[PDB]
């Protein structure tokens, strides 16, 4: 039975840590002592932690800490580091399984609301609602180009609330 453990890497080199970890496993051929290696990703939690299905021998512990760009395990102590939990592994796999299905909000662009844009050359500019292109599923938002509050129209996808 292989239980889960948490590994800390240099945050930013995490995929390379995962690849080097799989390669160190297939070098030192303790293939019966490692199950998987998880870096979950949403359309990226957790920011710098690598999940490893593993067992605990001191040889495999030295193996994972001899993988480069790995600080160490995170647990109660450094002698016998800590697995996490049954329901916590199940919930992380639940949200990893709820992969897609991530659209946007359903709120309305109230006239007068001060907005910022989401895409385009005018992306992320200090905008303020000027009118309601409602039944178009569209938008129009004031902006400061040429110093005037010029009337500029935006797609509904260009809101930021």
């Amino acid at each position: 039975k292989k239980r889960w453990y948490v590994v800390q890497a240099f945050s930013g080199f995490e995929g390379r840590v995962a690849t080097s970890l799989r390669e160190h496993i297939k070098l030192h051929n303790m293939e019966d002592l490692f199950g998987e290696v998880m870096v979950p990703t949403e359309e990226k939690f957790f920011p710098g932690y690598v999940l490893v299905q593993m067992v605990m021998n001191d040889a495999s512990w030295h193996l994972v800490r001899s993988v480069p760009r790995v600080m160490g395990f995170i647990g109660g102590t450094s002698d016998r580091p800590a697995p996490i939990s049954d329901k916590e592994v199940d919930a992380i796999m639940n949200r990893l399984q709820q992969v897609g299905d991530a659209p946007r909000p359903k709120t309305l662009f109230e006239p007068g609301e001060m907005v910022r844009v989401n895409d385009g050359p005018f992306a992320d500019f200090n905008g303020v609602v000027e009118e309601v292109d409602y039944e178009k599923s569209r938008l129009k938002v004031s902006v400061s180009i040429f110093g005037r509050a010029t009337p500029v129209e935006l797609d509904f996808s260009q809101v930021e609330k």
Partner: protein, 101 residues
Amino acid sequence: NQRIRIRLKAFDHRLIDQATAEIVETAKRTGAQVRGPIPLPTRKERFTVLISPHVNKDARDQYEIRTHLRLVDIVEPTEKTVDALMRLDLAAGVDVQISLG
């Protein structure tokens, strides 16, 4: 990248020309291709009024307001281009309408 379309409307033609030229220069300088300055038609709104305070119907004045249009389109808005345009403030009395999308 969708391209920014700009409509200039002014009662004076020289002023509108000045605005359009400045905008074109700014765009063309920042690299993006200005695709204009096309003069759209002028709206000649004519009025005919009685000049007398009371009778005499044939004594009349014909006035007219002439609205000049200029369409300046700029293809692919870049960083330099958008920021330059934003920085540049035009002459007052020239209505600009930035249609994009």
